[PDB]
Every structure is written in C-alpha cells, then in structure tokens.
C-alpha cells in the first residue's frame, strides 16, 4: 500500500520542542503544575521513572532514554519515507525533512548525554541511589537547582505525626517539629514539643481540657440578617404612631450592613438600595403589610428582615464566593486531628504568603522563623480562634498580623488589599490541590509564570535536563551543539511549556493547507494562481510544490483545465528551467520521466 | 465642531442585551424566562424579574436596566449612523462597503420590525393586563404566552420541592416534579410559620433525619484512604500482629486484603485500576518484611495493622490514587444532622436529587411520570428517607441509594427499563453542578431547569433562560398579527445547532474583522512587490459578487496609491485583460493622484 504514515508523535514524555525546532528535555522533580503532589518518601518517584522506568499502578512506565530511542526510531522512519520520494520529486518535503532531522541530530545527543551521565559521571552514586536507595534522596545536581531557584521554593510544615522523612532540605518556610514516631524506639507515636506554632496551634484550637472551638460560619444574608438583629430587642416591633419611622430606620441599617459586607467583595454594590421594588415600588408599611400581605405589626424584625430583602434584592447577590478551605462545613473544632488539620492550613497559609513575598522580591525572610517565636506564636493562634468562633474570615486575621509586623519580617512595606487577595487565591487553589495528601510534612511549590529555573511541563514540575547535567558532570563534559538550548528555553514567554509540540503538529497542517489551496485554486478554474502558488517558496525559500502527493498530484494532473494549466507552464519566463522541467514530471502524464508520489497519511 | 477629522467611527456594536443574530444575519429576539444558564436563579416572588426589565426597565443594584424597546432603539440609531456613514463615502466609491452596507441594512429592516411588535404588544394586545400587571398591584404573575411555552417545552422544566418554611408564592405552574408541601406561614393570620402536614416525602425525610425526640443522625464521612484502612481494618482486631512465626504469611494476606478493598473501591471511579498492586514498590522491590521493618525501618513486631497498612500504602500508592472525586452535595462538612433546619437541609437536597433524576427521564424520552407523586407514597416516602438515614451513618454515597429505589421501582415510574450507571452519573453530575449553584437561593420552593443542548422552545442566552419573542408574541396575539418577514425566523433558530445561543454576534464582529484582513492581504501583497496579483485580490469578489475594493478606507487607498510599485501596478491595470471597465474606471479614481476624480476616502475605525 504506497502510503507514507508519518510515525512522529506530537507529544512525547519529557519532550518540549520550542518554535525555533529547538528540543528541551524537561528534568522532572516532582508530579504537579504549581504545587508539588509527591513529598517525604516519594519526592524521588518521578526521578526514578525518569532515569529508569517504573511500574504505576501495573501499567509500566518507561525511561526517558527508552521514550527518546523511540522517537528516534519514528524520526527516522519518517525521513526515510520522505527520502523514498526524492527519486521522483528532488525536492519532496524539503522544510518538513530538514525539520525532522534537526529534531532527530538533537535527541540523539541527549541519549548520549544521559547515557554518560550514568556511566561516567554516578560514582558517588547519586543517580543509581534512585534505585537502590531505601528511600531515595534528590540527586544533589537537583538539590542546587532548588536552592538557586527564584520561582520555585520548598515550604516546611509540622503536623503532629511528623515524618522523618523529609526530602526538600533548603525549604522558604520552616518551622520546628515534633519528634517523628520513627525517631523512638517502637516508631508508634510522635514526641510532641511545647514550644512553637505548630503546638500553639494545636493546643489553642483544641485545648488539653478538651473544650470545643464552636466554628460559626454563616452565610453572607445570615451574617448581615443577625448583626443587623443584635441592635434590635426580641420584644421590637414595627408598630405604634412611629412605625414608619421605625420601618425606616430598620431599612437603612440593613442597607447600610448588607452595602458594607457587599463592598469588601465587590464595590459595584456601593450603590445597591432597599427603599424600592425593582418595578420602582416603595418598600413601606402598606406595601408590605396591607397589599403584599406578608408581615403585620406583630411581626418579628427579623420577618420584616427576610421580606425587605426578599422584595428588595436579586437572587445574584447571595452567591457565595469559593470557600476559604479554613471553612469545610464543620460545626466545631471537636478532636485533636481537627485542631491538627486547622493547624496545617494556618501554617501553609502563611507558607504561601512567605512564598508570594520572596518570588516578587519584597523579602527573603522565613517567615516561620518569626512565627514560631513568642508572643507570636500564642497571638496568631488566639486571633485565629477568635476567629472561627466570630465565624470571621481567616486570611485578613493572618495578614494584619504580618502588616502589623512588616519590618520584622523583611518587608520594607505593608501587603496592599490586591497582594493578599493573590495569595488567598494562590493558598486556596494550591492548598485545594493537595488536601489529601497522606502527609503535609513538606510541599515544593513553583510558579511558572515567573523568570527562573523552573518549569511547568506535563503535569511534571521541572527543570531543565542541561541545568542538571552541566552542574553533576562539574562541567567536565561541554555539550557541544546543545550548549545555548538551556539560555534559549529562558527567552521564551512562560516558564509554563505546551503538553505538545505545535512545530511538530504544524508540519502536519502544513501539508494539510496546501492541499485546501490546490482543491480551491482548481474549483476556482483560476489556473495562473496555481502555477503561483505551487511556485511560491515558503520562508527558507523551498517551493510549495514540494508538498505533493499522491492526492494532490492526481488532482491537478487529471483535472478538467490540466490542458489549460500545462499552457500557463510552457509560456511562464518567470519559472526558473529547473521548476519548469520539474513540475511537468510530476503534472504531466507525456513527461518520459512522470512518476506517481506516494499517499501520505498520519494520526491527528 | 471643526476638530473634525475624516474617519468613520462604527457604532454597531457586537453585543446587545436580547438579540442574537444569526450565521445567516436573521435577527432573533430572546424573551427571558428568569435568569441562569441551565438552572434559574430567579424563582417565587422574583420568577418575574426579567420581564419586569424587559418589557419596562428596572433598577438594580441602584444600576437602571432599560426596556428591549429603547436598547433596540439605540441599536438601531446605531445601525443608521453606520449606515449613513458608509453611505457618504459613495460619492469617491460606488460600491464602498456594499457587504457591509446590505446586512447593516438587513438588521436594522428586522430590528424596527421587532420594535414595531412590542409596541403593538403593548397598545393592542394586553386587553386583560397580562404583561401589563408586571408593573403592577401584587407579586406578578409569568404571563399566560410564556407559561403555554413552558407547559410545551420538551427541553425545559420547573420541578416543585417541600421545604419546612414553604412559599406559598410559587410561580412555576406546570411541574414535572412535585410533592406535598406545608400550609404556609402565609396562609396563616399571623404570618409567621408553616402548618406542617405530616405526610410525604418532605415530612418522612425532615422526621427521619432529624427526629422530634432530638437524636442527632451522625454523618460519618471517610476520605476513600480512611474507609479503606477502617474497613481492612474491620476484619482485623486491636490485638492482631504481624508476627512471628508465620509474619511472612501474615503480611501477605493483609497486602491481598488492602489490595482487593483499595481497587474494589477505585474501580467503581475508574477501571484503569484494576491492576493497581501493593506488591512491589515503585523500583520493582518486594514488599516484604525484612524490607519494612530491618531496612526502611518503619514497622516491627509490635506494630498495630493500621500501621502496617499506613506504610504499604505510603510505599505502593501513588499520590493521584488518593485525590478525591468533586464532593457531593450530599457531604458537605458536617459531622452530623442535628437540628430540624440541618435535616430540612438535607431533605431538600435529596428532593432535589429525585428531581433531576426525574427531569432527565421526561428529557431523554424514558418516561412522563412525575417521580413525586410516587415518593410522596407510603411506604415510598418513609423506607426512601430510612435508607438514605443509614446511608449517611455508614458514610455511603447517597445518590445510589436514590437509583436503586429508582431502579426497583422502574416500572412504576414510567420506565421500560433500570437506569444505567452511565446514566446515573449523568444524573450525578446535572443534579451536582444545579444544586451548587442555586444552594445560597432564599427559597428552595422551585426550579425552573433547562437543557439548552437538547432541541425545543427553550434557550440559553446572555445568562437568561428565554424563550423566541416571536413564539411568546404569536401566542399572546392569538395569531391575528401576521409576522411579515419574521414569520419564518422562529423556525429558523430552531434550524440551528444548539439551543445553547452565543452571547455575542460573530456575524456582526466578521463585518470589521473582514476589513481588518483585507488590510491584511493588501500590505502582504505590496511588501512581496506582486502587482498582478494585488490588482487580481482587488478585483476578485466575495461569494455575494463584490469586489473586494469596496473595502478600501483611507489607510489601505493611501498604502496603495504612494507605494514604489504604483507606477508598476497602474501599468497592469491598463494592459487590463481581465477586468471591466467600469472597475478599471473605479480604481484608477481611487487609486491613481492624476485621475480627475481622484478623491480620499475616510479612515476607518471601530471598538473591539
Ligand atoms: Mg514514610
Ligand atoms: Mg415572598
């Protein structure tokens, strides 16, 4: 069957290929976008299957020198297909054939670059531990890629069962830990610390005594409903010779509350009334009471509440923002796993606000350092109490906190209301993400959208495969044609790189657009312009012609004008002799030296 | 005043509140029903709100809202300005902008129509106040032309709940779903709170979930990782080692017993686990006791199993296998249900529930029963609420205790046929994204739930559930306005391809966009120094016939005619073989300084 199936897949594993035809070979750290999903014993995991394949969930997982030699094969069957019709059109596929050679000169010297790595530059075993290790550690070449980083940062926390076996030693954010269980003799228990954020947290939030913390959150119309109703009596009534009055005042004071609450979210609200029916009617006694029937004089203020609102207010209003994870539904802080569980969201709050600060330089502090001091320790965590029982919101309660002590913490200046709205942001989807985690010892988090050495690529957060082997080869191995594609990936846009490859696809699409052009230029009976644009050569120069085949070959060929095409060809001048002759091998059924290009097909 | 300068500011813009104007430039009119996407905010007292703006404007938000009437009115000012500033430019270009100009052109013909219509709605056809009572005298009423179209639709329906504190100012009158509900507080002298019958499907979940002797229902959620440790567990006993003599043995029957409860659970979720193995870590290393215990050193004789368990998973399992699906509704945070307005809560949700479920048998054409008057019956109602009781003491995912009742039951319900688990989860899925988006409502009475991506009356625009103008304007006509021109648009809206209508014009967009590439083309063409082909672009058409000239502007005329190649390009258009003359003609005016009547179109510019 004379088909040519291009095998070149538009994706591979650890495999970015930039819009020069540069390929980027992605190093990976650990699973995730932003933040890392692997820590304590599993950092090494992605490593592991990197340098030699594993089995996830008993679908195997190869290497990458196993995935590259496999690419390699397919770039190599797709060059030797295009080569097969260069004896019937010298120029078939010229752009798309030096392209994937480019690719193919490029892979071949990043398996010969960890292939070496392995053999010649592990003898301190720091690949290989990987696989032998109990439980594996980070290479060190990647241990320093970490620490110079400046967009990504490992954030160090203390759950009450602490492990051990933590894997990111130059972390932001740290604070001190209790004893892990695997540091005592029978390694059933953690021997807990009285000292620091982690305790004070715990034993505020759920105290020895074993008191609970009620969380008393309530919805947006129940918060402005009973504050409103604290300055209001059981006994009150809208009655009397002054209940228009009365009516009034409660009308402004429940503007005035729900406005309040409104703007801190959303200031179009500023402007938000309740002395009026959408249809313009006034929201007064005889309205309410005698014609929409729904209250009366005995009514509690509370019911004149719920009507005024009711008549008042679009359902759009009530829509919650997402939930602050510090409120998951619960009624109460009631056990010391719920103390602990708060007690993590507090400390990876103020991880998160540590690394929002240090990745737009405004401070290299650790701000656990501070935190785990007195009185801050105790302070943090009884605001942070008060807090939940207020049924107030979180995140402010911690970034006054931080305002109230900027200098201390490194900051020339206070967080403005947008920088901490960002980090709740950040901490809300970053902390979402990882919430079931089997343990919350550790996260290394990356921000892609910055200037650095770290990456975002296919679910894999990265690093680049030269920055790694330039530093464990101590430059004792230059990298010859590759020696500027570790500067290129950083001219780039984003450090957050396609799952795919678009230069690859493109070649694809390529063929694929010439083929619309012909079938149209042809319906169009406009035989000149074909003539032009088979003719017309692409940036490098190569002519559109090179990107026949079989289908568009038969289609001009025997097409209805072919007479009227082949005139146009004999009388042009402009074509250059060697086209001239070239195009009517490959159009013209007379030409003595005429052949068929094969079909081409591949996957979408 | 005379800061003018000669360029054409387009008005039209791309987007305007009720009007969707098709691929084939027909312009449609959407009535709104309430507010939503595929469920309405808007229900009770409120369910009029989008017609009160309609029909008459309204402020929210202390943010006026105007009338269809007057944001057509401008549109249509706007139509007349561009229309007259094409108009202008005729006297340098015959044809400039003839595209443009004709569906301008169009769109205002069928706008005024429109326009006309209210109007006459107005004036002529509310004899018995039905659109007019909206502005008026009590909570309004939808009016008699939408709800026929709602009792018609076979894509759109409301569905009707019992809350403890029922409404009695429901709106919706056609129910698929419905079931018994309290006397509201408002059908008592004092206004103040319900009378509760004490029967149906409300009053057996609220009593059951919640009951009069005040017993708190626990709530006992686990993650998938807890459940699976607590039930391997379940089999086991505080007691249990693994050792000694037989420690081998031992471990090997816990890793079977994790490994067959870890995948019977995940597979139910997705069956590419059914491989999944505890057996070997990452690396290939066996999962052993010598390995846990002499070299890791995480484990040993005296450990209990559910540390034994912790440790296999933490070497075996991937973080991925542990992140949990979207909650349901069902389970959001509480350890328990333990006041009358937590089990009103969860009643409601499960009300819910059987509503989608019933919605999406009448949608997909399985069945006409209303699911309501079947749960309302005892034992119906009491053994529903007992299961769903125990389901959340077991920490079990409620929705299937809902299908398998469904499912016993199919016959009874309507149904040929069980519902598949494909269909379930569906269902899930609906009745999860709905129910998350009306859960803050101030009344849980009823529902008006749409699915814009089936076929029938009922459509999705602009964040508004709505219905064709011109269906709700023929009903309420009775049919004795004739439509005129619009008398085939409702078909043809239905002709198209989803109910799901774009929020704005692409047709009205391309119109500049098509300008924008012209652009494009002739800057191309000059800077590869082609001649012959910019005069074939020039002189080429679009499919109406056109030649694309007529979209030259100040900037593209200027670019051509004090271009290197002029000289070169005038050559071309006389040796002239191809083109007529009276385009030979045109663009040597336009395009030629020494032509007589040479003279400057205007700029050209709009907003993106
Ligand atoms: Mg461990
Ligand atoms: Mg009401």
Redesign the interface.
């Known amino acids: 069957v004379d088909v040519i199936k291009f095998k070149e897949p538009e994706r591979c594993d650890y495999l970015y290929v930039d819009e020069n035809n540069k390929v980027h070979i992605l190093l990976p750290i650990v ?1 995730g976008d932003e933040i890392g ?3 304590t ?2 950092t090494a ?1 992605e490593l ?2 990197f340098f ?1 394949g ?6 195997t997982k190869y290497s990458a020198e196993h995935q590259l030699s496999e690419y390699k094969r397919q770039l190599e069957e797709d060059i030797k297909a295009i080569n097969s019709q260069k004896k019937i059109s010298p120029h078939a596929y010229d752009d798309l054939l030096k392209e994937k050679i480019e690719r193919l000169q490029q892979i071949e010297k990043y398996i010969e670059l960890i292939q070496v790595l392995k053999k010649q530059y592990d003898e301190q075993n720091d690949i290989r531990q ?2 032998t290790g ?2 594996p550690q980070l290479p060190s070449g990647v241990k320093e890629i970490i620490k110079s980083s400046e967009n990504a940062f490992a954030v160090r926390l203390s759950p009450y069962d602490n492990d051990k076996f933590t894997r990111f030693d130059d972390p932001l954010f740290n604070v001190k830990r209790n004893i892990s269980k ?1 540091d005592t003799p ?3 228990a953690p021997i807990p610390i009285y000292e620091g954020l982690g305790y004070r947290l715990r034993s505020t939030l759920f105290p020895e005594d074993k008191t609970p913390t009620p969380i008393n959150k309530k ?3 129940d918060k402005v409903k009973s504050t409103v109703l604290s300055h209001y009596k059981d006994e009150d009534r809208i009655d009397g010779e002054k209940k228009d009055e009365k009516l009034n005042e409660l009308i402004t004071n429940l503007q005035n509350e729900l406005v309040k609450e409104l703007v801190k979210s959303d200031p ?2 500023s ?3 309740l002395s ?1 029916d ?3 009617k006034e929201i007064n006694y005889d309205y309410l009471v005698n ?6 004089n ?3 203020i509370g ?1 004149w509440i ?1 009507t005024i ?3 008042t207010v ?7 923002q997402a939930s602050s994870p510090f409120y ?4 109460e802080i ?1 056990s010391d796993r719920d103390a602990d569980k708060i007690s993590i969201r507090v400390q990876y709050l103020l991880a998160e606000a540590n690394i929002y600060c240090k990745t737009n330089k405004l401070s290299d502090a650790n701000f656990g350092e501070f935190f785990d001091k007195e009185p801050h320790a105790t302070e943090i965590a009884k605001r942070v109490k008060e807090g939940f029982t207020q049924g107030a919101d979180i995140e402010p309660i911690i970034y006054d906190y931080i305002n109230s002590n900027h200098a201390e913490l490194g900051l020339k200046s206070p967080l403005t209301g947008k920088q901490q709205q960002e980090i709740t942001d950040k901490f809300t989807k970053h902390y979402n993400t990882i919430k ?4 919350f010892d550790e996260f290394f988090v990356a921000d892609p959208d910055k200037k650095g050495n770290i990456f975002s690529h296919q679910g894999r957060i990265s690093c680049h495969f030269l920055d790694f082997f330039t530093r464990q080869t101590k430059g004792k191995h230059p990298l010859g044609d590759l020696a500027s594609h570790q500067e290129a990936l950083q001219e780039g846009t984003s450090n957050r790189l396609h799952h795919k490859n678009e230069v690859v696809a493109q070649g694809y699409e390529k063929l694929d657009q010439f083929k619309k052009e012909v079938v149209k230029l042809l319906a169009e009976n406009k035989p000149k ?1 074909l003539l ?1 644009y088979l003719v017309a050569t692409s940036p490098t120069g190569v002519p559109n012609y090179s990107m026949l085949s079989k289908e568009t070959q038969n289609y001009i060929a025997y097409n209805r004008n072919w007479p009227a095409i082949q005139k146009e060809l004999e009388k042009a001048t402009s074509i250059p002799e060697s086209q001239k002759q070239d195009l009517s091998r490959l159009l013209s059924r007379d030409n003595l030296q005429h052949d068929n290009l094969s079909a081409i097909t591949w996957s979408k």
């Open positions: 699973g999903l692997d820590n014993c599993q995991v592991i299957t030699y594993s089995a996830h969930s008993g679908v990987l696989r109990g439980i695997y029978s390694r059933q919805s947006l119309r179009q609200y402007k938000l009334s009026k959408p249809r313009g014609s929409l029937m729904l209250v009366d005995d009514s509690e019911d719920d609102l009711d008549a679009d359902s759009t209003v009530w829509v919650a998951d539904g619960a009624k009631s079931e985690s089997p343990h312009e032009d």
